[PDB]
C-alpha cells in the first residue's frame, strides 16, 4: 500500500516527518510518497489544485492523505472517500478534494469519527497529523473505510467554487488563470483546446493584448519568445521558451483571461 | 529498520542524497525517512530542537542519524546513544542530541571509533556522511551498538544550555521564545501551561505588552486576531488565526517573554 | 532495484511526485531515492554537475533517472547508458550525463525508441516524465536495456564542454569555479591538489588577490577566516570557517581562478 502525503506544513523542519513517524508506527509496511508539503499556508484552493492529477498518476492501491487544515480542532471533520479507481482519499472536509474528485469521481464516502483510527490524545492544533495522517495509515494497514465512521452521501462533500471557461459568441473564450507553474513561470488556464475548436491566437487580459502562435512544445518557438500550448493536464497554457511568462507579462492566478483565434 | 535522517546540508543538490546512496550500499533493507536537511547552516541548536519530538513519533526500531557538524574533521567525535524506547541515535557529540534525550532519556552510550562502521577513506570535511550516516546504516543493518567503540557514561554526552521558565512570584512566568514555527509565524515558548496554573493573559516582551485570550486552537478566534494556546508539543505558543504572529509583533527566537494572568 | 531521481521541476508542487506515481505503477517494487528536483530551471550544466558523484555513492543495482529537458517534445532523444559499475542511467541526450560518465564511464548505450517503455500518450511538454522516468521504471522492473531501442556508440552521447585546469609554467594553476556549494558559500574549483604538487597559497581572481593557508578542514582555521582545502570530491575548494566565502569575496560559478604556492 502507498500513502501519498500532502500538507502546508513545509519540509524545512521536523513537523512533516513526525507524520511519517506516525505512519510507520501504525503501518510499517506502507510506502510513503510525498506529494508536497510546500502548499501555501492555509491555502486550501492551492492544495486542492495540486491534488487534481494525483489519482490518475498513482496506483489504485494508494491512500491519498492530504491536509491544509486551518480549521483543525473545530467542527470541521475529516472524511474518507473511495473514488472510481479504488483509491482512498483522507482529508479535511473543507474543499481540499474538489479537483481530485472532479478528475476521478467519488463513489462512496465516510466521516471520520471512530477514535480507533485517530492518534489519541488528538492535539487540537494538529488534526492534520492526529486525524488525517493517522486515519490514512490505518487505511493503508488494512482497516476498512466503513470502520472510520458513518457513511455520508457523496453530495455532502464540501467543494470549492470553480469558474467555468465560457465561450463568448464570436469564437473567443473568456476563462481564468488557474495556477502558475511556479518553477518556470508558465501560465495555466482553464480553457480547453476543444473550446477554441499551426494557427495564431489573440490573448487578452487586463495588462495587455498580444498575438501569440500555438505550438505543441516550448522548443517550437525561439528562446525567449511566447507560445500558447496544450499543457500536460489538458488545458491551454501560456509560456516563453526557456523564460518566465509570469515575469514578462505579470499575469497572476485568478486573473480572467480571454483567448481566441487569429 | 528505519533510519531517520537530518542534516544542515540542504535538499537543493545531490549532497544529502549521496548519504542515501551510502545507506543503501551498507543497509539496502533500511527505510530512509528524512527529518529535514534544511537546518540553518552550522546551527546545532536549531537542529537539536528539530530532533526533540522525533523519538516519540518514530517506531522503537528507528535509528536517528543526524548531523550539523561544523567540527567535522576535528577532535569532536560521533556518538551512539540507546534511549529508553529502544531507538539508537547517531550524531556528533556537540550538543545536537540535547533535546531528543531530554524527551526520551539515554540509557547507554558509545563513542564511534571503530573504522568498520565508517566509510573509509573518511573525508575530513564530511564526517556527517562518512562517520554519522555510515555508522547509522551499519546499526540499521544489524551491527551491535557496542561494536562501534568504547562505552561512555551518559554523563559525558555534550549538552547545550537550556533556559528554564521561571515563575516570578506574582503568578507571571518569565520565559523564552524557543523557536519560530516558520511556515506560519507562530511563536513557541518554553512556558508550560501547568506553570500558569477560557481566561485572558497579559504577555510582555521588549517590543510590547498586549492582552491576549487563551484558546485551544486557531479557529476559536476570528481571522487575523491573536490567541495564546497550548501547542502540539506541550508548551505555550502565540499565534494569529491564519496570520503570522512573528511578522506582526516582530518577536524572535531567544527573546525573553513574560506571561501571566489577566 | 533503486531509482535515483533528478529533475529541474521543483519539489514545491505535485509535478515531481506524479513521476513517482508513474514509477510505482510500472515498478511497484522500486525504491525511489530523490537526488534533487531543485536544479535551476533549464540548467543542464548544473544538473549534470549534481549527477557527477551519484554513480560512486549508489549501489550497482541503481537506475539513475534524470532530466533537465527544455528540448522535451523535439528531436532530442532520451538515452540509456550502462556504466562500468553496472548502473543504468536514463536521461535526455543533451549533455546531462557528461560528468556522471566522466566519473564512471559508459560501456554501452542505447537510444530510447520503443513505446513499450514510454508512458503513452506521451505529452510533448513532459518527456521528462513520459519517456525518461517511464523508461527508468521499466528498467527497474527488469526490462532489458537493449529492449529500449537501438544501440548507439558511446561516442555519440552528447557532452558539454569542460574547461581543464592548466598549469601555467611557474607552478600556479589557472582554473575555474565549477560550482558554489550553495548551502554554505564554499567555492569549488576544478584545480586538483596533485596539480599544486601546511603551506600557504596565493589565490587570484578578477575581484581580488589574497593569501590563504591550506588545511584539511574548516575547523583548522578560526571562525570567520579563510582556508583552501581539498573538498569531499577531490578538488581544491575555498571557504571560510562557519562563513560564506561566496558572499565575502563575491566569487561566482564560471569565474576563472588562478592558484599557486606561497
Ligand atoms: N496560526 C495558524 N492559524 C490557522 N491555522 C494554522 C495556523 N498554524 C497552523 N495552522 C494550520 O494547522 C494545520 C495542521 Cl492541522 C495546518 O494545515 C495549518 O493550515
Ligand atoms: N564553510 C564551512 N565551515 C564550517 N563548517 C562547514 C562548512 N561547510 C560545511 N560545513 C559543515 O560540514 C558538515 C558536513 Cl560534515 C555540515 O554539517 C557543515 O555544518
Ligand atoms: N517554459 C519552458 N520552456 C522550456 N522548457 C520548459 C519550460 N517549462 C518547462 N520546461 C522543461 O520541461 C521539462 C519537463 Cl520534460 C523541464 O525539464 C523543463 O526544463
Ligand atoms: C512546465 S514543466 C513541463 C510540463 C508541464 N506539465 C506543462 O505542461 O506546462
Ligand atoms: C503551526 S502548525 C500546527 C501545529 C503545530 N504543531 C502547533 O501546535 O503550533
Ligand atoms: C560544504 S558541505 C561539507 C562537505 C563538502 N562536500 C565539501 O567538501 O566542501
TrEMBL record, chains A, B, C:
Record flagged with keyword Repeat: no
Coiled coil: none
Keyword annotations of the record: DNA-directed RNA polymerase, S-adenosyl-L-methionine, Transcription
Domain S-adenosyl-l-methionine hydroxide adenosyltransferase N-terminal: 3-149
Keyword Membrane: no
Signal peptide coordinates: none
Residues in S-adenosyl-l-methionine hydroxide adenosyltransferase C-terminal domain copies: 175-258
Pfam families noted in UniProt: SAM_HAT_C (PF20257), SAM_HAT_N (PF01887)
InterPro entries: SAM_HAT_C, SAM_HAT_N, SAM_OH_AdoTrfase, SAM_OH_AdoTrfase_C_sf, SAM_OH_AdoTrfase_N_sf
A cellular component annotation (GO) from this entry: DNA-directed RNA polymerase complex
Residues that coordinate or bind substrate: 8, 67-69, 125-128
The family this protein is said to belong to: Belongs to the SAM hydrolase / SAM-dependent halogenase family.
Protein known as: DNA-directed RNA polymerase subunit delta
Naturally occurring in which organism (per UniProt): Streptomyces noursei (Streptomyces albulus)
Amino acid at each position: 500500500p502507498i500513502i501519498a502525503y500532502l500538507s502546508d506544513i513545509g519540509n524545512h523542519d521536523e513537523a512533516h516527518a513526525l507524520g511519517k513517524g506516525l505512519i510507520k508506527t501504525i503501518a510499517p509496511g506502507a510506502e510513503i510518497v510525498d506529494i508536497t508539503h510546500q502548499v501555501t499556508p492555509f491555502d486550501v484552493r492551492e492544495g486542492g489544485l495540486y491534488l487534481q492529477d494525483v489519482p490518475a498518476s498513482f496506483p489504485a492501491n494508494t491512500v491519498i492523505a492530504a491536509y491544509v487544515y486551518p480549521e483543525t480542532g473545530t467542527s470541521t471533520r475529516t472524511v474518507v472517500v473511495r473514488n472510481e479507481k479504488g483509491q482512498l482519499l483522507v482529508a479535511p472536509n473543507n474543499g481540499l478534494l474538489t479537483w481530485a474528485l472532479k478528475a476521478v469521481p467519488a463513489v462512496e464516502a465516510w466521516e471520520v469519527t471512530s477514535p480507533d483510527v485517530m492518534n489519541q490524545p488528538v492535539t487540537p492544533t494538529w488534526y492534520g497529523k492526529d486525524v488525517v495522517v493517522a486515519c490514512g495509515a490505518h487505511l493503508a494497514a488494512g482497516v476498512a473505510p466503513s470502520a472510520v465512521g458513518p457513511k455520508i452521501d457523496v453530495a455532502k462533500l464540501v467543494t470549492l467554487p470553480t469558474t467555468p471557461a465560457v465561450q463568448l459568441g464570436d469564437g473567443s473564450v473568456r476563462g481564468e488563470v488557474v495556477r502558475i507553474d511556479k518553477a518556470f513561470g508558465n501560465v495555466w488556464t482553464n480553457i480547453s483546446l476543444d473550446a477554441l475548436s499551426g494557427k495564431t491566437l489573440q490573448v487578452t487580459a487586463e495588462g495587455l493584448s498580444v498575438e501569440i502562435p500555438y505550438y505543441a512544445t516550448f522548443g517550437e518557438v525561439p528562446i525567449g519568445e511566447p507560445l500558447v500550448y496544450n499543457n500536460s493536464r489538458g488545458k491551454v497554457a501560456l509560456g516563453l521558451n526557456q523564460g518566465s511568462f509570469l515575469e514578462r507579462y505579470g499575469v497572476a492566478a485568478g486573473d480572467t483571461v480571454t483567448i481566441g483565434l487569429v
